[PDB]
Amino acid sequence: GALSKEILEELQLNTKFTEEELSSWYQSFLKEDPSGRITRQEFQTIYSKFFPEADPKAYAQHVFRSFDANSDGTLDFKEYVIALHMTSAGKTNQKLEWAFSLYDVDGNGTISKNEVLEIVTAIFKMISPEDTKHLPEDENTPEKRAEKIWGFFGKKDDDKLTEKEFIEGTLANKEILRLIQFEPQKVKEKLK
Ligand SMILES: [Ca+2]
């Protein structure tokens, strides 16, 4: 029941659901997954089903990991609902702390150049083959996009990017926001 309250607590104005609606979704969730827990592979299946034009396995794995920096174990209903909101609802700039957790692949508290490339590659694979030709030349491969992000942050190859700086840059430089953007529809849309 009151798992819905803590979901609302953590999404706040990001929510697309009332407490009653979340409880309804939860009861349906329990019919299909009675433990109230979903594994990474079950989570990946949701994205595979709903992004048929793409190759969403890596993306879904990184989103799952954003909760804990762990590929093992499960998400509960709260984390599952929050995950779907992060990928698919609301405004990117209301998600910046979560975005830091997405990009900090190993969970060590800072983002490295390789981590940016890993996440940018996973997001890139969410784009349909048809759409990637609308990409600007200097943003049309994962390497180009990740290096542009790293350059906008003023970083050398072995530098570390902190949460403070990530939040600042993603707020202030709209090119950084556009390039780190992780919601597939928003990448698609801005492209078009
Ligand atoms: Ca890291």
UniProtKB/Swiss-Prot annotation:
Variant or mutagenesis effect after changing K186A? Reduces interaction with GRK1. Reduces inhibition of GRK1 activity
Describe what happens upon changing V187G.
Reduces interaction with GRK1
Q: Name one GO molecular function term.
A: calcium ion binding
PTM comment: the record says:
The N-terminal glycine is linked to one of four different types of acyl groups. The most abundant is myristoleate (14:1), but 14:0, 14:2, and 12:0 acyl residues are also present. The Ca(2+) induced exposure of the myristoyl group, known as the calcium-myristoyl switch, promotes RCVRN binding to the photoreceptor cell membranes only when intracellular Ca(2+) concentration is high.
Q: Which UniProt keywords apply?
A: Calcium, Cell projection, Disulfide bond, Lipoprotein, Membrane, Metal-binding, Myristate, Oxidation, Redox-active center, Repeat, Sensory transduction, Vision
**What GO cellular component is one of the record's annotations?**
membrane
How would you describe this protein's topology in the membrane? Lipid-anchor
State what changing E147A does.
No effect on calcium binding to EF-hand 2 and EF-hand 3 domains. No effect on interaction with GRK1
InterPro entries from the entry?
EF-hand-dom_pair (IPR011992), EF_Hand_1_Ca_BS (IPR018247), EF_hand_dom (IPR002048), Recoverin (IPR028846)
Q: Which family does it belong to?
A: Belongs to the recoverin family.
Q: What is this protein called?
A: Recoverin
